[PDB]
Amino acid sequence: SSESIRMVLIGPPGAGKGTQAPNLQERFHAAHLATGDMLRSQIAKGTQLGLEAKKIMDQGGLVSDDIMVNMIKDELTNNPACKNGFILVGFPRTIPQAEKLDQMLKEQGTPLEKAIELKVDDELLVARITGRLIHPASGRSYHKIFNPPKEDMKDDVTGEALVQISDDNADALKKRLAAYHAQTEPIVDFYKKTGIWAGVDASQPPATVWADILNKLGKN
Amino acid sequence: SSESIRMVLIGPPGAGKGTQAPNLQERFHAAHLATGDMLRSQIAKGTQLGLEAKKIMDQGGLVSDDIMVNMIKDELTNNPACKNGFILVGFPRTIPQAEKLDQMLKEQGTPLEKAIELKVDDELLVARITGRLIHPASGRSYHKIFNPPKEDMKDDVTGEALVQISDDNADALKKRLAAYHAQTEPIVDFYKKTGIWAGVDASQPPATVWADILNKLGKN
Ligand SMILES: Nc1ncnc2c1ncn2[C@@H]1O[C@H](COP(=O)(O)OP(=O)(O)C(F)(F)P(=O)(O)O)[C@@H](O)[C@H]1O
Numbered sequence: 445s446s447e448s449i450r451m452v453l454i455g456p457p458g459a460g461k462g463t464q465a466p467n468l469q470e471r472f473h474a475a476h477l478a479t480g481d482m483l484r485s486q487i488a489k490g491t492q493l494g495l496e497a498k499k500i501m502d503q504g505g506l507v508s509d510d511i512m513v514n515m516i517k518d519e520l521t522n523n524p525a526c527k528n529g530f531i532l533v534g535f536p537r538t539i540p541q542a543e544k545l546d547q548m549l550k551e552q553g554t555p556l557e558k559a560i561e562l563k564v565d566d567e568l569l570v571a572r573i574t575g576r577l578i579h580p581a582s583g584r585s586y587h588k589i590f591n592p593p594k595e596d597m598k599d600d601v602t603g604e605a606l607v608q609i610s611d612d613n614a615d616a617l618k619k620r621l622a623a624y625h626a627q628t629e630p631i632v633d634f635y636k637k638t639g640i641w642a643g644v645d646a647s648q649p650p651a652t653v654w655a656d657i658l659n660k661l662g663k664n
Numbered sequence: 665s666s667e668s669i670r671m672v673l674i675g676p677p678g679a680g681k682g683t684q685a686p687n688l689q690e691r692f693h694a695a696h697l698a699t700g701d702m703l704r705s706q707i708a709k710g711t712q713l714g715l716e717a718k719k720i721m722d723q724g725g726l727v728s729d730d731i732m733v734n735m736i737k738d739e740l741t742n743n744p745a746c747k748n749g750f751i752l753v754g755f756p757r758t759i760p761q762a763e764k765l766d767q768m769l770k771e772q773g774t775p776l777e778k779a780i781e782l783k784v785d786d787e788l789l790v791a792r793i794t795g796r797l798i799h800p801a802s803g804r805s806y807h808k809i810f811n812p813p814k815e816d817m818k819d820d821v822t823g824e825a826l827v828q829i830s831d832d833n834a835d836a837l838k839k840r841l842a843a844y845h846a847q848t849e850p851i852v853d854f855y856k857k858t859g860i861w862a863g864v865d866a867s868q869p870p871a872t873v874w875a876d877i878l879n880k881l882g883k884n
């Protein structure tokens with residue numbers, strides 16, 4: 445095993461998934477699989493799933509549980525980086541999706557090993573979301589206080605300007621945190637019942653949260 | 665005038681919006697605006713709007729209303745193809761969106777000249793969706809029964825294989841078409857109000873529908 449990870453990283457907006465996923469990524473050289481990013485990449489390719497997703501999506505609807513799970517499957521089966529495990533972010537989001545994912549990873553014979561849930565109190569989140577900065581290109585995020593860029597409003601690797609989002613606000617966030625707890629509790633619960641769940645304290649500085657995770661992972 | 669147009673093309677899936685859109689382009693030399701494609705392009709280009717849209721939905725969410733109109737406004741202001749006019753397809757879809765789209769075009773100085781609704785019966789529609797073949801790379805559509813390709817499952821101009829990506833499923837179709845109606849009836853009613861709506865029987869053969877459209881537009 446060791447130097448392979450098949451896991452699911454969950455947490456509310458503001459917990460740092462975008463900050464940890466990349467650390468995990470480089471360590472295990474695993475594939476960082478984001479659902480929306482997979483959706484878009486597939487629509488670009490002119491694939492049957494991509495086109496089917498495209499038409500049902502750009503028509504005011506959502507893509508089916510199985511179209512998602514069939515795409516994840518396509519990725520495991522073809523993505524080059526999917527051979528040293530993966531890091532699934534933002535999926536599942538309903539029980540049946542967690543259900544069909546397990547039933548298909550089962551098929552593939554490559555089960556999830558961990559479901560890391562990043563924990564942090566809302567009050568801390570709606571306060572920390574106020575000062576986030578994203579390199580629009582890479583999506584590399586920084587925080588003006590907690591993980592500041594080395595140069596005033598500049599991306600560490602490109603020297604390009606960082607930007608803050610209009611939705612990066614207290615009111616808008618409160619609605620999203622509420623929605624998050626209501627829909628993630630059953631999935632968290634699903635992962636507890638199968639024994640792969642692990643809580644991590646996301647209230648700690650980045651490097652401490654990194655270490656906490658690397659430890660709950662059990663590799664090494 | 666005469667060979668300039670600013671309009672919306674509304675109608676149920678399987679109605680024929682994609683099949684007629686290029687005529688309108690020939691006739692008027694204007695841009696084809698499909699919000700779905702607009703969004704995905706913004707996202708991929710690394711714009712603040714791309715960034716926000718890909719944050720909202722990529723977290724299983726629904727992209728504003730304002731992000732949409734503002735993204736359309738970007739097309740208009742800065743896209744050359746949009747200096748002749750534009751053939752807006754698949755927007756608006758709600759009334760707020762219609763009110764917001766109107767308000768911006770009002771401020772802009774270029775309000776819609778026409779809203780064309782493609783009408784066809786639900787029984788036919790499900791049939792239109794079912795037999796649909798598609799050339800992925802170019803997006804060109806065919807119907808294995810009402811408008812077949814010259815060579816079996818082959819794109820007329822490229823010879824490249826066609827695909828069946830229209831969610832070929834019994835119930836789901838009739839259920840979705842019901843959704844379109846409940847969603848769309850107010851947009852049409854909103855446009856008869858504004859005095860710019862024109863309905864078109866899209867059940868007739870393609871060229872017969874185009875002549876109906878061109879006459880309805882009243883620019884020829
Ligand atoms: N341990 C930490 N302590 C304090 N701030 C942190 C910590 N880790 C990350 N942050 C940050 O708080 C903000 C949110 O983190 P990040 O942007 O990386 O992930 P998330 O907020 O979880 C999200 F992308 F995934 P999204 O909005 O998509 O849910 C950023 O400003 C980031 O710099």
Ligand SMILES: Nc1ncnc2c1ncn2[C@@H]1O[C@H](COP(=O)(O)OP(=O)(O)C(F)(F)P(=O)(O)O)[C@@H](O)[C@H]1O
Pocket residue numbers: 499503675676677678679680681682683684792793795796797805806807808810811866867868869870873
């Ligand atoms: N008037 C017509 N008579 C017969 N077949 C037609 C006619 N117009 C279009 N078709 C077709 O019916 C199907 C639907 O057409 P098309 O793919 O062009 O538009 P629409 O279904 O209206 C859509 F693409 F824009 P969308 O999926 O965006 O909602 C295709 O199979 C195409 O061949």
